[PDB]
Paper text:
Gene transcription is a fundamental cellular process carried out by the multi-subunit RNA polymerase (RNAP), which is conserved from bacteria to humans (Cramer, 2002, Werner, 2008). The σ54, which controls stress related genes including those involved in nitrogen fixation, nutrient starvation, infection, and other cellular stresses, forms a class of its own (Buck et al., 2000, Merrick, 1993). σ54 recruits RNAP to its promoter sites via binding to the −12 and −24 consensus promoter sequences and forms a stable RPc that rarely spontaneously isomerizes to RPo. Instead, it requires ATPase activators bound remotely upstream of RPc to convert to RPo (Buck et al., 2000). In order to understand how transcription is initiated and how initial de novo synthesis is carried out, we prepared samples to capture the RPo and the RPitc state by binding σ54 R336A to a promoter (−35 to +28) with a pre-opened transcription bubble (mismatch between −10 and −1 by mutating the non-template [NT] strand) to form RPo and then adding UpG di-nucleotide as well as GTP, to allow de novo synthesis of a −1 UpGGG +3 RNA to form RPitc.
In both RPo and where nucleotides were added to RPo, in addition to RPo or RPitc, another conformation in which DNA is yet to fully enter into the RNAP cleft was also captured at 4.1 Å resolution. In this structure, DNA is caught at the RNAP cleft and likely represents an intermediate state en route to RPo (see discussion below), and we term it RPip (for partially loaded DNA). Interestingly, we observe an ∼30° bend/kink in DNA just downstream of −12/−11 toward the RNAP cleft, and the density is sufficient to accommodate both DNA strands, suggesting that the two strands are still in close proximity even though they are not base-paired between −10 and −1. The regions between −10 and −1 are in fact sandwiched between σ54-ELH and RNAP β-lobe on one side and β′ coiled coil within the clamp on the other side. In particular, the highly positive charged β′ coiled coil and loop (residues 305–325) within the clamp and the proline/glycine loop (372PGEP375) in the β-lobe are positioned to stabilize the DNA phosphor-backbone between −10 and −1, suggesting that they play an important role in stabilizing RPip and potentially guiding the DNA to enter the RNAP cleft. To accommodate the DNA path, σ54 ELH, which is single long α helix between residues 317–355 in RPc and RPi, appears to be shorter (no clear density for residues 317–330 in the helical conformation), suggesting that ELH undergoes conformational changes during DNA loading. DNA downstream of +1 only interacts with RNAP at the β′ jaw domain, which forms a basin to accommodate downstream DNA. The RNAP clamp is wide open in RPip while closed in RPo. In RPip, the β′ clamp opens widely, losing interactions with ELH. Although the RPip state reported here has not been established definitely as a bona fide on-pathway intermediate, RPip is broadly consistent with the proposed RPi1.
Author numbering:
A (entry chain C): 797 to 895
B (entry chain M): 115 to 257, 259 to 293, 335 to 396, 398 to 413, 415 to 473
C (entry chain C): 1244 to 1341
D (entry chain E): 1 to 75
E (entry chain D): 14 to 1049, 1058 to 1067, 1075 to 1088, 1097 to 1126, 1133 to 1376
Write the structure that this text describes.
DNA sequence: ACAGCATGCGCGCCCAGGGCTGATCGTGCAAAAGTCGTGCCAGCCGTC
DNA sequence: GACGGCTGGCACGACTTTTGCACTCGACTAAAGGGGCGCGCATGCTGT
């Protein structure tokens, strides 16, 4: 952890029961800012209709959503993904749609 | 993810737009004709005759259907597929580098001949350089238009069944996976291992297999042998297709392949052929007769032209 | 979390169990004892059925909120009739009297 | 005008249950429509306007009954 | 489609099933899988249940459904009700009437019993072979007999023609069809009068009540076997959760098509004239088929399936989960709540909460859609959404007007009482956390460690008013279980107001006059101190002394700057002397209390808010901190330690001499270190004086120190001197998980480091203390479920019923000092009859009134020791409480209104206290260990004493002892009210003679438990007795005899020259004298002695009415009890004598103590003691009043140990709920010797005295039990079992035909409706008058 | 003539033991259904 | 513009495969049917 200057006094009810007050300079100084790391994994399988392929085309998706995807459908290292965006797609076949 | 789809969500969208009486009735009469593609309203005369007269003319239902076509997944229902394209172009941007006009020229008419190739049509639309190619890029960037439902999160994996391994120039069964249960599985892992020994996938297709041979080997009933392989799918190192290597024929010839290599290699021989548009079934039957398969040319033409084959309509 | 309306489930037509997948938290019989301790009536009525286990009540109530009606359209939805049918399967009868 | 305590409006006819239902059916008229408030509006919702009409004594069960008889007689 | 008032369940008829729905299926053809189109006949398909989708059908006619009530071709036309799928079911037609499995018998099983014949016979003839003979006569055999294939062949051979026997139940339908119910019931009553057999009683009562149930129910018993069988809607069948569900794979579907198949086979074979064994095998296997339909069993294992499904089908699948469960009942999702962490802030007046803006936008999202579509900026709802996630600055401007006056609900995970949830007005705040108002840490009970909180949003319309009326916190300033003001200021407020009103001496400036006083302006201008001096100031003060007016005045008074500045906050006329003293938490709670009493609610809520503001403000500018120099080390403590061990080293030396054991040394050590703890504590209290002082010299204590520790501990804000004793001074003793205190305490404190042995031993206490919280919290939260389970059914009904008889209210106090006066007990409620002054003819109240502070002051300044008060129980009112006796309406005030729910606050109010007591009952004995020397019975305060329940015994000394079992002592306060009331030990030796009284001093009793009086009251030798072996082995001067294994009492010897009073048996006795030895009065003849309420597990025994170990017998009227009078050769102490008829006799098997030695003829109500009294004998003899004060006074005596207060109202309500299910002594209209309801008994007595007949119905005996059998005694079958089996409940309700009547809670909760409690209850009334209008 | 204790008998409860269902498992076969081959008929084209 | 040849589509027949009955066939579960043990109690011989 990190030690800081601590003052003992009730101030405007800001410290009530077990609560605590901190300054803005603590936020400005990056003090005890935390970093996290997660993982997402995609799986490719072989179904009864044959094997699965990966990206290189997608229906019903605009170009703005696929602009951040490199060829083969992998994201650029260092790109910023926010919310419901797409990382690495895939495809599963159907049949008898060509009549 | 256990969610409502199709006319449940679409009808739920219809209930939001206020419809006093008639707009709601004819609206519910429209929403039931939507298909998985979504742009098929079939015959409008059926929707008009289904009302059972009492006014409600065609002009009143036309604006209602046009209101159905404006829902969330852009183009909906309408007809001829040339309508929903106009709605896709109208609500897309409304400010474009001359894409709107040329979009109405291409979407209006002449699009039938412009899909295969441009050629002389490039002089018809007067466009030139990268304007026409960029417009075709826009047409390629449009869209089936709907099909936004589904929401198919999961795939139902085959999970294999029994397994095999190739040793020193030979493939043998192993039935790898996972006392009456151990022996019960040992029977299938046994007859399946001998069936994998007699049949090798080997090279190019598979050796013809007759249920009478596998039934004669262990003296097991062929009904029980092929009955289990029908539901279950044996998963080998390549492929998925267990009952396909069980049901066959005697090929009706001494010099030979079975229906598996007959139809398989028939479509393979028809794959590379017709330098332009030969579409000759008698020539393919002669090529099959040159290999000694004893083809009557009646079964080769009818059986070869089936299963997604373009024949004989390729002419 | 602070959900509002997410996707639902086919079984019992109830929202999903937990957050991120948008859970609908929990409402216990102890809080029922609290509202009953207040003598609360319409609030208990909406928390138990229309807002929780009622299917078409989300559509009618939702259309009442969008249009600004703010009316419950009182009555007994869903489980009462299903109970009439499940009991009616048995050889004993249920009626309606005043 | 915010109402901190409802007891002053309940003191008219004491129940503390009836104010919610009577003020509710009074809030149905101005809520849905086809009616006008008898008190000048502060731009606040009709929810408090109900309690303020109960506090002014202009609206009660008997008044809504007489107005109901007037609406039935005028129809 | 309309409100549900009530329904009785009746047995359906085949004509009723043909009435409800209609369908015909001759073939098991459902749907062709290559088509997916309606098909002819079949079930589970679209052929029945009307249209398949919306309203339409494929027939070729009747497609528009212009006609109804018939079938077309492949699609049922009849709807006649509504909906689409779930609509009218249809049915199938069986050829031979059959099936049910669990129809006649519910295991058990009333049918097959009512008819009169064993169940094995019917179960045997329905299956297998055996036939029932019918159309008998002309021979000795009867139709009640059963036959077998051999007896069938020999029967048709010998008996010949007119002999009919059938396999199916058609023979049972005819035999039951020929039964006459009225004449049979008359014969069962005529046989009921003659037969005295107890086993015959219950059977005849059951049969009679059954037959009657068929009489008034109107249901034919032959309807039990149904010909027409309806089928259920297919889609209502819940699909298996595993993998995907399929309607064709349904467990019952295979059974349905199986019954259809066996039905077609049955029709084909009956139309084919098949052999008898064949078609009869078809009938039996059809019976087994429907056996498989409804149940999985009772025929054996009938289960079928692909995976062999277990069968939780129709039997177990009704409303799912083996009963009525799914509706309500916990885990349903809330749909529009949220959760977040709470943060405190010095704003948000009492109704408001900080709501993060990110959380507010999603909850009010639909209102956002509505007002965006309303105010005119919008196109479509989806584009409105687009505006929602694009978050324009105008959207928040919309939301500001959205929230406004529409508050929100707050919920914790636990709710221990009503106030646990409250509503507040949201105020948008930047953050990820929710802000809550500081003033209440109590109702929520949780401080802020980062706990997570739930937020529920009701909408509706009237839910807004319901939120702003009975919920918002500003409406309830009081607790429903007490009436003492909640939301008492604390923490920084107490420190700020204590530092604010404080007085100072000799500072800069003084001796000046300020008006108003106007001094506050200076305080910010310095040149003055807020705590410096007292200065003449002119203050204006209002008052209410003039009725409806305010009398003012302005005076010159002395006060401190802070006090006069705080006087601005006083709202117009509170007295000035309340702020004229140093304000602690006490004076703060009294300030808000007197402010709420005098000025009401609205003044004291904003008053409390402003006291909060100035409290955190001046507490903010106070600037108090802690430090190492604040804690002082006593200089005499080093001596107190040195004095302690110097004594211990002496006592330990005694252990080297062998004169002192380990126990005496132990107690001496504990006493030495305890006295040392007291001495170092006083040295600490004297040390904390004169530390941080204002500038001054001399004086004495120099303006008592301003240091933080004395302000915190002395002011009572947060800490206290108890922990200061651990901070400064010694540590005292420690708690080892053994039960023996260590002899080497910790002599140090936190000023210096502790030794590894001190900190090592100090851990055992915490280790033994950490595991109690959750373990006791389990049961502490478990009792509330059962309390609500018993208490939920009571509701408010009437306004004032009126009555005369009631509960006599007299002040009672615990031992030693006075506990509660008559005020708190008589406060509120209702006073029955009149209460006279000490003078005659003068009445305090004309009839009755609700007692408030004024009338209580009239009772205080006058003398009344007995106040007649009404209550529950008494003033009994049909279907609930009269809502008069229950008044004083805690946490409010008014005459109590109608519609509230009673027992929900009574349950949560009793079960709300957490954990348990400090000690466990009397068994641990922590106050006194065994008996040191004597019990020390004496009085203290002035006034005369009056001996209650005493019996004089002649002694030679001037003092007279008492042999009575129970003895009380009365003291004089003013008119003779109880001051010190303590229980005198049984048979105490009085140092003061009887008939003599004295006020103060002069100890009147001496009691040691080595003795108990048996003495000769007259001089002369002991009565001659025989000494024989076998009676001398008894356990506590040779002993002679003992009445236990058989001190037997004999005639007293009145002379020393001749051998010639009555002695009670203690149960264990040893004779201390020899026969023929001279003894005198007042001298020892034989002297030697021989549940326990409190604790929560004992409270569960108080409500549950457990039976004690040693019961206490009670005495009735007449009888003769002296010295085992009328005692038989065996089983001593049995009372023979008639004594005025009433042959009262009690059987005591000679090993138990004797009732009394005197009194001769006694009466009902006399207390013979003999151990803890059982509530059954008290209710049977004393009455309902002694049971009421029994349970109430005991439970109160349990809760008074922790200082928590609970009013008697709730406990009395529970006692009233335990008085249900009482039995009648004599026959009524038609019934004998069974259980009944008190309400029905009272109504039938009202009909008894109503018109003509002298006696219809008779006296009854009240029964109690509780908490278990009373909860299962509910007369409503819908709420009867939420736990027990559903089948037997539906069978009892099916055959009996009892009405719902819907009075209760879980009734309208589980079935569902607007509940008949609260506002909704008024709704239920508001319709009835309309229904009464036409 | 009444009371005690010993004996005999009836019934409740726990333990042990057998027996249908369950776990499969088999599949023979006559026939019914699915599929492939095969011949026939109608539609399309070229040149005489 | 009429006709015969080519070819594709379709209905029918034959081949192959696989489903309801029909009689199996030997190594479990735990729930229910039977029996023994023990206990309660009623009857009666007897000693007081």
């Amino acid at each position: 952890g990190q030690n800081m200057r601590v003052a003992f006094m009730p101030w405007n009810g800001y410290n009530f029961e077990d609560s605590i007050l901190v300054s803005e300079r603590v936020v400005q100084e990056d003090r005890f800012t935390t970093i996290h790391i997660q993982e997402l994994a995609c799986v490719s399988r072989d179904t009864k209709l044959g094997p699965e392929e990966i990206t290189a085309d997608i229906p019903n998706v605009g170009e703005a959503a696929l602009s951040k995807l490199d060829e083969s459908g992998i994201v650029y290292i260092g790109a910023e993904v926010t919310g419901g965006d797409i990382l690495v797609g895939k495809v599963t076949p159907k049949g008898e749609t060509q009549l | 993810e256990t969610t409502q789809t199709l006319q449940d969500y679409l009808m739920w969208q219809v209930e939001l737009t206020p419809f006093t009486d008639t707009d709601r009735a004819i609206a519910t009469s429209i929403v039931d004709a939507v298909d998985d593609t979504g742009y098929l309203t079939i015959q409008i005369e059926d929707i008009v005759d289904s009302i059972g007269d009492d006014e409600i003319g065609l002009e009143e239902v036309e604006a209602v259907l046009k209101r159905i076509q404006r829902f969330d997944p852009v183009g909906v229902a309408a007809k001829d597929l040339r309508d929903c394209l106009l709605i896709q172009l109208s609500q897309f941007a409304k400010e474009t580098p001359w894409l709107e006009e040329a979009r109405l020229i291409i979407s209006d008419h002449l699009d039938l001949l412009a899909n295969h190739d441009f050629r002389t049509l490039m002089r018809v639309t007067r466009l030139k350089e990268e304007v026409l190619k960029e417009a075709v890029n826009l047409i390629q960037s449009l869209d089936x238009x709907x099909x936004x439902x589904x929401x198919x999160x999961x795939x139902x994996x085959x999970x294999x069944x029994x397994x095999x391994x190739x040793x020193x120039x030979x493939x043998x069964x192993x039935x790898x996976x996972x006392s009456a249960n151990d022996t019960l599985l040992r029977v299938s892992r046994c007859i399946v291992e001998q069936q994998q020994a007699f049949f090798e996938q080997g090279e190019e297709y598979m050796k013809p297999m007759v249920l009478a041979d596998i039934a004669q080997a262990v003296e097991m009933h062929e009904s029980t042998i092929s009955r289990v392989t029908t539901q279950k799918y044996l998963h080998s190192p390549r492929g998925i297709x267990x009952x396909x290597x069980x049901x066959x024929x005697x090929x009706x010839x001494x010099x030979x392949a079975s229906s598996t290599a007959i139809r398989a290699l028939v479509k393979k021989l028809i794959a590379a052929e017709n330098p332009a548009k030969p579409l000759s079934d008698s020539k393919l039957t002669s090529m099959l007769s040159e290999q000694g398969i004893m083809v009557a040319r009646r079964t080769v033409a009818k059986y070869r032209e089936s299963l997604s084959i373009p024949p004989s309509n390729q002419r | 979390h602070a959900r509002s309306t997410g996707s639902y489930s086919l079984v019992t037509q109830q929202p999903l169990g937990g957050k991120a997948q948008f859970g609908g938290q929990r409402f216990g019989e102890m809080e029922v004892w609290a509202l009953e301790a207040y003598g609360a009536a319409y609030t208990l009525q909406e928390m138990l059925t229309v807002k929780s286990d009622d299917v078409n009540g989300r559509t009618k109530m939702y259309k009442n909120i969008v249009d600004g009606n703010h009316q419950m359209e009182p009555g007994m939805p869903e489980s009462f009739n299903v109970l009439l049918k499940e009991i009616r399967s048995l050889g004993i009868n249920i009626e309606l009297e005043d | 005008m915010a109402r901190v305590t409802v007891q002053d409006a309940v003191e008219k006819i004491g129940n503390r249950f009836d104010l919610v239902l009577v003020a509710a059916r009074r809030a149905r008229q101005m809520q849905v429509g086809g009616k006008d408030p008898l008190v000048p509006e502060e731009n606040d919702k009709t929810t408090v306007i109900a309690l303020r009409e109960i506090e002014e004594g202009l609206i009660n069960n008997q008044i809504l009954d007489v107005r109901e008889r007037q609406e039935q007689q005028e129809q | 489609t309309e409100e549900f008032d009530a329904i009785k369940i009746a047995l359906a008829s085949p004509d009723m099933i043909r009435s409800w729905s209609f369908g015909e299926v001759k073939k098991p053809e459902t749907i062709n899988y290559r088509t997916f189109k309606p098909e002819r006949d079949g079930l589970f398909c679209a052929r029945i249940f009307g249209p398949v989708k919306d309203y339409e059908c494929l027939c070729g006619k009747y497609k528009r459904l212009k006609h109804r009530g018939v079938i077309c071709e492949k699609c049922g036309v009849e709807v006649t009700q509504t909906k689409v799928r779930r609509e009218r079911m249809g049915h199938i037609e069986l050829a031979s009437p059959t099936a049910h499995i669990w129809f006649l018998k519910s295991l058990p099983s009333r049918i097959g019993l009512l008819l009169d014949m064993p169940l094995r016979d019917i179960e045997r003839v329905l299956y297998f072979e055996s036939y029932v003979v019918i159309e008998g006569g002309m021979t000795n055999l009867e139709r009640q007999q059963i036959l077998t294939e051999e007896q069938y062949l020999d029967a048709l051979e010998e008996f010949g023609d007119e002999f009919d026997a059938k396999m199916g139940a058609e023979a049972i339908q005819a035999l039951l069809k020929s039964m006459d119910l009225e004449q049979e019931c008359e014969q069962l009553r005529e046989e009921l009068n003659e037969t005295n057999s107890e086993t015959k009683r219950k059977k005849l009562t059951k049969r009679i009540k059954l037959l009657e149930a068929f009489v008034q129910s109107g249901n034919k018993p032959e309807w039990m076997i149904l010909t027409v069988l309806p089928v259920l809607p297919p889609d209502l069948r819940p699909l298996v959760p595993l993998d995907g569900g399929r309607f064709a794979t349904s467990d019952l579907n295979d059974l349905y098509r199986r019954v259809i198949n066996r039905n077609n086979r049955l029709k084909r074979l009956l139309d084919l004239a098949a052999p008898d064994i064949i078609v009869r095998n078809e009938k039996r296997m059809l019976q087994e088929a429907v056996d498989a339909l409804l149940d999985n069993g009772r025929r054996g294992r009938a289960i079928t399936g692909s995976n062999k499904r277990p069968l939780k089908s129709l039997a177990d699948m009704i409303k799912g989960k083996q009963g009525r469960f799914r509706q309500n009942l916990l885990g349903k999702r809330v749909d529009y709540s949220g959760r977040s962490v709470i943060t405190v802030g010095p704003y948000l007046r009492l109704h408001q909460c900080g709501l993060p803006k990110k959380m507010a936008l999603e909850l009010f999202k639909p209102f956002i859609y509505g007002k965006l579509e309303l105010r005119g900026l919008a196109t479509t709802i989806k584009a409105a959404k687009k505006m929602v996630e694009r978050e324009e600055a105008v959207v928040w401007d919309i939301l500001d007007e959205v929230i406004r006056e529409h508050p929100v609900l707050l919920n914790r995970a636990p709710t221990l009482h009503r106030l646990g949830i409250q509503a507040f007005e949201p105020v948008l705040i930047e953050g990820k956390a929710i802000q809550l108002h500081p003033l209440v840490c109590a109702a929520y009970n949780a401080d802020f460690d980062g706990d997570q909180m739930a937020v529920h949003v009701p909408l509706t319309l009237e839910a807004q008013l319901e939120a702003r009326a009975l919920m918002m916190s500003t409406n309830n300033i009081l607790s429903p279980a007490n009436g003492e003001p909640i939301i008492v200021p604390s923490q920084d407020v107490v420190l700020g107001l204590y530092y604010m009103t404080r007085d100072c001496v000799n500072a800069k400036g003084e001796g000046m006059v300020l008006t108003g006083p106007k001094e506050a302006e200076r305080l910010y201008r310095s040149g003055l101190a807020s705590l410096h001096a007292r200065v003449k100031v002119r203050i204006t003060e209002y008052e209410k002394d003039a009725n409806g007016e305010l009398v003012a005045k302005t005076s010159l008074k002395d006060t401190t700057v802070g006090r006069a500045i705080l006087w601005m906050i006083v709202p117009k006329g509170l007295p000035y002397s309340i702020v004229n003293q140093a304000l602690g938490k006490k004076a703060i709670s009294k300030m808000l209390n007197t402010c709420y009493r005098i000025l009401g609610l609205k003044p004291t809520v904003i008053f409390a808010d402003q006291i909060m503001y100035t409290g955190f403000a001046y507490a903010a500018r106070s600037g108090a901190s802690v430090g190492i120099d604040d804690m002082v080390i006593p200089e005499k403590k080093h001596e107190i330690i040195s004095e302690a061990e110097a004594e211990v080293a002496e006592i330990q030396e005694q252990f080297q001499s062998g004169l002192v054991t380990a126990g005496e040394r132990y107690n001496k050590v504990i006493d030495i270190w305890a006295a040392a703890n007291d001495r170092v504590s006083k040295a600490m209290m004297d040390n904390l004086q004169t530390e941080t002082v204002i500038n001054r010299d001399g004086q004495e204590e120099k303006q008592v120190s301003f240091n933080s520790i004395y302000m915190m501990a002395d002011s009572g804000a947060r800490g206290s001197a108890a922990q200061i004793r651990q901070l400064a001074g010694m540590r005292g003793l420690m708690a080892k998980p053994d039960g023996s205190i260590i002899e080497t305490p910790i002599t140090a404190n936190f000023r210096e480091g502790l030794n590894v042995l001190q900190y090592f031993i100090s851990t055992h206490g915490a280790r033994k203390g950490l595991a109690d919280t959750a373990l006791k919290t389990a049961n502490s939260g478990y009792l509330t479920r059962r309390l609500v389970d018993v208490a939920q059914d009571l509701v408010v009904t009437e306004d004032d019923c009126g009555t005369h008889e009631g509960i006599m209210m007299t002040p009672v106090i615990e031992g030693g000092d006075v506990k509660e006066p008559l005020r708190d007990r008589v406060l509120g409620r209702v006073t029955a009859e009149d209460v006279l002054k000490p003078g005659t003819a003068d009445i305090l109240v004309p009839r009755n009134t609700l007692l408030h502070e004024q009338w209580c002051d009239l009772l205080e300044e006058n003398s009344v020791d007995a106040v007649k008060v009404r209550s529950v129980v008494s003033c009994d009112t049909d279907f609930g409480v009269c809502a008069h006796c229950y008044g004083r309406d805690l946490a409010r005030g008014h005459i109590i209104n109608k519609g509230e729910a009673i027992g929900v606050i009574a349950a949560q109010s009793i079960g709300e206290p957490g954990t348990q007591l400090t000690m466990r009952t009397f068994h641990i004995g922590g106050a006194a260990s065994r008996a040191a020397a004597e019990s020390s019975i004496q009085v203290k305060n002035k006034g005369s004493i009056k001996l209650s329940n005493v019996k004089s015994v002649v002694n030679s000394s001037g003092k007279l002892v008492i042999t009575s079992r129970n003895t009380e002592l009365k003291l004089i306060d003013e008119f003779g009210r109880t001051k010190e009331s303590y229980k005198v030990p049984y048979g105490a030796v009085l140092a003061k003679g009887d008939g003599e009284q004295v006020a103060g001093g002069e100890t009147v009793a001496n009691w040691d438990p080595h003795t108990m009086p048996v003495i000769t009251e007259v001089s002369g030798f002991v009565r001659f007795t025989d000494m024989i072996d076998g009676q001398t082995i008894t356990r506590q001067s040779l002993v002679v005899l003992d009445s236990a294994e058989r001190r037997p009492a004999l005639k007293i010897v009145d002379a020393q020259g001749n051998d010639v009073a009555q002695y009670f048996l203690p149960g264990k006795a040893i004779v201390q004298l020899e026969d023929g030895v001279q003894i005198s009065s007042g001298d020892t003849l034989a002297r030697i002695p021989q549940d326990i309420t409190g604790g929560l597990p004992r409270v569960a025994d108080l409500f549950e009415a457990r039976r004690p170990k040693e019961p206490a017998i009670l005495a009735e009227i007449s009888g003769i009890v002296s010295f085992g009078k009328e005692t038989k050769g065996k089983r001593r102490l049995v009372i023979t004598p008639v004594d005025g008829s009433d042959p009262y006799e009690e059987m005591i098997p000679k090993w138990r103590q004797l009732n009394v030695f005197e009194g001769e003829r006694v009466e009902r109500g006399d207390v013979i003691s003999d151990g803890p009294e059982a509530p059954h004998d008290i209710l049977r003899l004393r009455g309902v009043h002694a049971v009421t004060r029994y349970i109430v006074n005991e439970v109160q005596d349990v809760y008074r140990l922790q200082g928590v207060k609970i009013n008697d109202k709730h406990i009395e309500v529970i006692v009233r709920q335990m008085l249900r299910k009482a039995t009648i002594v004599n026959a009524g209209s038609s019934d004998f010797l069974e259980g009944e309801q008190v309400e029905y008994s009272r109504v039938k007595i009202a009909n008894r005295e109503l018109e003509a007949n002298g006696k219809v119905g008779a006296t009854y005996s009240r029964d109690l039990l509780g908490i278990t059998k009373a909860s299962l005694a509910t007369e409503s079958f819908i709420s009867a079992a939420s736990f027990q089996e559903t089948t037997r409940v539906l069978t009892e309700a099916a055959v009996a035909g009892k009405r719902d009547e819907l009075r209760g809670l879980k009734e309208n909760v589980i079935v569902g409706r607007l509940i008949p409690a609260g506002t909704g209850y008024a709704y239920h009334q508001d319709r009835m008058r309309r229904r009464a209008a036409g």
